[PDB]
Amino acid sequence: TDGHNDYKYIIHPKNRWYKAWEMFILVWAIYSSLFTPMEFGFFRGLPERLFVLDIVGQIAFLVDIVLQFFVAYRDTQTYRTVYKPTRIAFRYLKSHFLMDFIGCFPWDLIYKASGKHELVRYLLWIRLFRVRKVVEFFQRLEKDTRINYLFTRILKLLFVEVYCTHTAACIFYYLATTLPPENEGYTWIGSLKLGDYSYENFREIDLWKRYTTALYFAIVTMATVGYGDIHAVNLREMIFVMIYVSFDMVLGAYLIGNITALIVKGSNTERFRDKMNDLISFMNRKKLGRDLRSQITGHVRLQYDSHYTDTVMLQDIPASIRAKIAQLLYLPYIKKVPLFKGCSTEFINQIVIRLHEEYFLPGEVITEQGNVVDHLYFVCEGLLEALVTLLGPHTSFGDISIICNISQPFTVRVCELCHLLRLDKQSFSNILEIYFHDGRTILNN
Amino acid sequence: TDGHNDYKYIIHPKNRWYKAWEMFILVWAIYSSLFTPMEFGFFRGLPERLFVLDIVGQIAFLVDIVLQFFVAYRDTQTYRTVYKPTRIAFRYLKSHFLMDFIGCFPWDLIYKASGKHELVRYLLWIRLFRVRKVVEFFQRLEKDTRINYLFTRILKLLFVEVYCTHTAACIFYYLATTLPPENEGYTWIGSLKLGDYSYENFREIDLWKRYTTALYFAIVTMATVGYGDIHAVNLREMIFVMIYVSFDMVLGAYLIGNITALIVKGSNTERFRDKMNDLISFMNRKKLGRDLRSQITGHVRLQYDSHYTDTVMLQDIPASIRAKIAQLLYLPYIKKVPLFKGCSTEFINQIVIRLHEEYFLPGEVITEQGNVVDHLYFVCEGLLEALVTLLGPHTSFGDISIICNISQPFTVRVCELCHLLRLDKQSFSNILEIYFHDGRTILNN
Amino acid sequence: TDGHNDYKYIIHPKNRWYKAWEMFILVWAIYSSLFTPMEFGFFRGLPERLFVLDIVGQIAFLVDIVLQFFVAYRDTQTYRTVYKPTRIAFRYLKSHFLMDFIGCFPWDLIYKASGKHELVRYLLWIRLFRVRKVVEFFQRLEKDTRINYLFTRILKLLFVEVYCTHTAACIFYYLATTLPPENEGYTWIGSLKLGDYSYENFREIDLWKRYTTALYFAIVTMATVGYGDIHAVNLREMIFVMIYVSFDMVLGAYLIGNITALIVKGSNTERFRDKMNDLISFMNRKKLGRDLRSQITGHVRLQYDSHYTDTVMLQDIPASIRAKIAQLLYLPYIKKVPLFKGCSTEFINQIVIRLHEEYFLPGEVITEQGNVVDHLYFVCEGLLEALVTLLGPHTSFGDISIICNISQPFTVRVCELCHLLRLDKQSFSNILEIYFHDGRTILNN
Amino acid sequence: TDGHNDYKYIIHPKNRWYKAWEMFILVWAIYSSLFTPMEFGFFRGLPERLFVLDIVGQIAFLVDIVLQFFVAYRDTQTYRTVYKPTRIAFRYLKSHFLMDFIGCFPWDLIYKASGKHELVRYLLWIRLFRVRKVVEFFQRLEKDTRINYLFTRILKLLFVEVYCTHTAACIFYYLATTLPPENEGYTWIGSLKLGDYSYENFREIDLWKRYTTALYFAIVTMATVGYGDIHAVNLREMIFVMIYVSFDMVLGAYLIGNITALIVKGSNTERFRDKMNDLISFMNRKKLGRDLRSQITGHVRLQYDSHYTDTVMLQDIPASIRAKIAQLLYLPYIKKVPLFKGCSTEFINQIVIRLHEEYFLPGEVITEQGNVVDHLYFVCEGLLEALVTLLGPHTSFGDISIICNISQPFTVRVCELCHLLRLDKQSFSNILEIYFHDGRTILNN
Ligand SMILES: [K+]
Ligand SMILES: [K+]
Ligand SMILES: [K+]
Ligand SMILES: [K+]
């Protein structure tokens, strides 16, 4: 049914070893996309101590480049995995090969060996295409797990603001170095003074102090607090902050809208907790007794912990798996009454449709004597009494009266924890109207 | 049905005296969780005047520790209260015993008697586990009262912001004391100047001025106003404010989303106030008369003050309590017509299903002469006329015409306040089709 | 039906002259609730030029006090207007008499004539109970007009922010005057300097400059901009601004939530504009022709301008007014076919139920030849052709084929603007199954 | 059907050349509405180099004025295009002629030639009525394209904030020039100092520096950041900023509400992605097997990519176009079974109602042996097996058993990609109950 593995060169994408390589390269992509604006903004050429780290950081991405010619992929309009080499290679060469290949050049060595022209350093910015691995990690997370999709959209949106503030801090520091050191007093950092400390001659301050000051400015700006102890003084800095606040206005509105859309679509538990209020306000706008309505409030409080299970599989998709699990679950404790002592298997797998499951309290009254019967009760386990018999597990009652349209002679009550099954004789009568092999064996008592 | 109180050592959790102890310890937990950051941040060791208060404040929590081995608790998967001592003790020793016990040590005396090492004072922060009583108070409030659940979620969220601003103010003051007094001018408070007052030599300013300044900074920061007369100058202070504003951005978005989700799920009164607009715009997009549509607008305005009571108990839960209250309410003013002079009790408790309650105005017209009858009217009290008889309380009409399919001879009108009951003869005919002991006695006139 | 006007002292509340007095006193209540914080905050005793205005401003409220013993009011649980004098007077004396009476005392003369004690001036603040007229004006506006209720709730909430900023500005100015003039440099205004202008000796600056500065501070604070050129320097001013920003945080969240809840509950026009997109995307996800689907898109675009009128009066309230207007509208252009040449009036007022109104385009095809008929068309006006006759106004067709279950012989098309009525013969057949006096006269052709 | 083009002077509004003129004038309207506040605010009379541009800019609007007497327009209450000259001219002369005509006067030459009175320059502000073309462009965009209406409302609202900040910057600069140059130190720009640069003698600073400073202030104010390095010092400037922040508070609340209302009305894909979670949590709250429920989860994942197509054309509008495309699509691969070898065309175009389209996986089981048949399967293409025959394209099965109420003898399974059609024999039986010409030819095998 595969039609392939006649090649034995191609890697199945859901292999165990290949999924270990994919999480190795994601950490390198996270590190490489955080270091690149710091390399562009705070240096003009790397020092000697970062040479071997800069060389090692590209070998992993070159190995990842050569691996993509050996991976099978799943087609979109069809749903078969392609195992053919030329179809793999042409899809790679038309999608992602070019930027991945030219982001692996040694751009720090080319800058130092060609007379230190500043426009050569602008090609470092194409290494920010490596966040593709992070967006593919977030795309794979939201489909196949047990967490809802809106929470992952909030976490995905929260990851974007960290990256945007870090990049804005690096660019805001870089703009101050495009003036000569003799015009230092006309920049945002060369004229800064905080406490009794002066930021003059700022190119010789160590790296983490400058980075912390720039990140402090960017994070205070992004939250719209804006103290004003650090601000812009140039025209280029004014243009940069005018672009930056316009972007994060829309970003903050998107975050607020996503959190609101999460909260508005609340859960079903509070979709019946309000119904509690409507019912008891109806019961108390006029006057009424207190005892058996407190009984029915405890009843619905334990009943709504099971009644969400009804609507999800009433008839939403027409599966025969519900017939399989219905033969699996209910009637292996219902064959044991003499009611179904000799019914055909047609009626055993036909009965299962309207056995609704509800749980009850040790203080309710089960059935009435002066009654026309409505529901038939089918017990899982029980120690429940009646005042003439005490009904136990794997039993039933009520069918002594309903088909012959008689009142029940029993006053059935409870002292224990309940698991019984509903039955209306609407479905019993209409399919007993078709098949009566059972109906002979039901009235054979 | 209890199976216990054979021990007589165990306290029922819904006792009257025990609920007085629970509100005594909640005030101590509120006080103890507000004083602990002020003790950590503004002192290095307590003075002499707080000694007896510090000793007394732990005795109540030790007594509360020894009381938890004597309280019965309600099981989760079962719903019976456990009264056994070893099952109580093992649940306490696996849940909450450790942090409650080690938060009761005298950590101020241990700090002074071991050479004043600063790391010993960090163990004061485990006394913030005593806000468990406040979150359990807010969990008990939202289930069993007459207030809706979203308003309590807004009040619960508003309590968190007070506690967060108070703790942030204490930590922001504490960070300034981790420098020596000779580097005082490189702190946020040691370099502050407001008006013509200087904050130098700040360790000798009295306590409430320092606390008020720090709380003013924290509350102005939390609302995102940010005047900038107080700000950070260090690197540790910059890192602290970078963490703090990122937290309250998400907190403010959560508050806005909760208030919006409260407002969007509006009440039913304005769910028919718009329906007023749709109906009268339909009536006025074409031309129509004015008199009897003003009648029906006053009619629906007094009718929608009762028609919310229909849907809540049509058939939502299948209770026989509605049959009990239906025998209790309606027909003790409906037996008094000669219509039901001799009907069986089966028909008396069967009739009750489709008597819908509506109230009317002193100016409407009740019934028509040239008619096929649709509704049957069953009056609570009345002084209403017809032009040949004036119908009063405990009466009926319309049944002279409907079962024999005749037109009504009466022109029934009103001058008084109305309480009558609807009836369609759909239900009357289909259950009169089953039982006619009544039907003999109805036509016995 | 009134039972009263046997008194002739009492004023009906919906009189014409009394509604002129109610709008006279509303302007005085607006003026009196804006002037009172300016009188408290910017003066210590009024000057001579405001004496006659201060005296005149209380006479109107005294006259309004004596008028409330002569107004009839509508009861709540009943809905009759009460005309009895003692029932009027006791309701006034238990609701609103006390604060209205003691807000009319001459508190400026009492302050000057009792030694100028400052605590006497605090009784001016009970004149802010006169905003009751504004909240009653906003309560009367939202019930009985043609504007929706959420827009009036937004305008009501926008009125509150103006009043809150004006009162906060007056209190913020008042706090600076509670220090002596020798400690002037320790206040927010006594130490202010803007441009090359100094605010020293601030008690002799004229009134509108001081008021404009305080209102500028309050409005910049309320919008959370916070420039920081004006700020607090005292402890009492810090406590005041800490209270003030906490209030308007919740106020701004309430405003955002109300505007969002207005926008989310959009109109029905865009509730079918999306349905346009779903239908044409279904029609274009597979391939299809272009001509007659462009016809049906123009059809539904002119059809949804009338199909909102269906659901509002299908069966929502069971009125006979729809039978009255149904005899008024449709069939006075439908009696003119020989189809209903002699039907009984029972069938004339019975037919009206399923004549749905739709409008059409000059390019559609009306009917088919090779057909089993589904709908019957009942024209208002027309010049529509068929290829053998050209059907005009007050006519019909299709009934030549449907009751005898024949195909139609006509190919009916259009060139003009359409107003015809639907009819399914489901309703025609089931009520023709009951009454056939008509059925003789229908087949009398 | 037109009734016109007997004039040959009038231009049809959907001509090809006229739609080229409409986009030419939109660029001139955008330029003219951006230049006018810069001409009012930063100059007192234009210089010599802008003379020919100022003259040329009005000739296009004069030509556009004379063109509007020759355009046909579509009536509102009718839907016919009017081609009559006097009806065109009177609508123009009552709607838009006056402001368009008097905005074309040479107001720069009139100011210089009448003694330079400043009130003459205020008539430049009536050229801001030319944004009518931009609001008509945004009105035409949102009706007839493939983008949803709420996204265009967000983009329309984002365009307003750019125009409002640009106009506010020009007015804020203009207010500083209304004082003499000797009171320069009492303005916002004449007292400004940034870094080591001073803004004194500000009328001789070049234009783009002044404009960039004013726009930086306005954009920082609009986002509610508010650094405070530029602020107001006068009373007129205070009044202007008090008006401006009150406007953009409501504007920001409107933007947040629109984005939230976009996000809350999410798409249908995540309206079944939650249903995945509810179904598998129902299947895993009790214990169950893993194999065939993983089958049905892959089934519903490929099934919900087609089941949105059902509800949109079940019965929403009653079109015969669905009968036309139903004869076009399905049964030209269903005539090829001997099941419909000789049925009448009535049954061929009657069958089409309940053939629902679903797609399946290469691993499912199609049918059962021990069965009462529910659905009938009608294949597009297939290579599917049974264990006795391998069923291919243009075939069917299941009808060997269902009409005679027999069990199926086949165990039908799959290995390929599925396109089969559902059929319940409810519709087959009820319309086979009417027409049995087919029923003879179905049982003719
Ligand atoms: K802000
Ligand atoms: K600020
Ligand atoms: K701010
Ligand atoms: K500021």
From Swiss-Prot, chains A, B, C, D:
What does the entry give for GO biological process? monoatomic ion transport; response to abscisic acid; response to calcium ion; response to cold; response to jasmonic acid; response to water deprivation
Sites binding a nucleoside 3',5'-cyclic phosphate sit at 339-445
Q: Which residues cross the membrane?
A: 23-43, 51-71, 95-115, 122-142, 157-177, 239-259
Q: Which residues lie within the membrane without crossing it?
A: 213-232
Topological domains on the Cytoplasmic side lie at: 72-94, 143-156
Question: What top-level branch of life does the organism fall under?
Answer: Eukaryota
| Induction profile | Up-regulated under drought, salt stress and cold conditions. Induced by abscisic acid (ABA) treatment in roots and shoots but not in guard cells.
Task: List the molecular function annotations (GO) for this entry.
Answer: monoatomic ion transmembrane transporter activity; outward rectifier potassium channel activity
Q: What membrane topology was assigned to this protein in its record? A: Multi-pass membrane protein
Tissue distribution is: Expressed in guard cell-containing tissues, in root epidermal cells and in root hairs. Detected in vascular cells of the root and shoot.
Give yes or no: UniProt keyword Chaperone: no
Q: Where in the cell is it found?
A: Membrane
Q: Which UniProt keywords apply?
A: ANK repeat, Ion channel, Ion transport, Membrane, Potassium, Potassium channel, Potassium transport, Repeat, Transmembrane, Transmembrane helix, Transport, Voltage-gated channel
Provide Extracellular-side residue ranges: 44-50, 116-121, 178-212, 233-238
Presence of keyword Transport: yes
For this record, an example GO cellular component is:
monoatomic ion channel complex
This molecule's function is given as:
Major selective outward-rectifying potassium channel of the guard cell membrane. Involved in regulation of stomatal movements according to the water status. Assuming opened or closed conformations in response to the voltage difference across the membrane, the channel is activated by depolarization. Conductance of the channel is modulated in a potassium-dependent fashion. May interact with the cytoskeleton or with regulatory proteins.
Give the similarity note.
Answer: Belongs to the potassium channel family. Plant (TC 1.A.1.4) subfamily.
Quaternary structure and partners: The potassium channel is probably composed of a homo- or heterotetrameric complex of pore-forming subunits.
Present the record's domain note. Answer: The segment S4 is probably the voltage-sensor and is characterized by a series of positively charged amino acids. The pore-forming region H5 is enclosed by the transmembrane segments S5 and S6 in the Shaker-type (1P/6TM) and contains the GYGD signature motif which seems to be involved in potassium selectivity. The KHA domain (rich in hydrophobic and acidic residues) present in the C-terminal part is likely to be important for tetramerization.
Q: What is this protein called?
A: Potassium channel GORK
Record the organism: Arabidopsis thaliana
Gene label: GORK
Coverage of the whole protein, first to last residue? 48 to 502 of 820
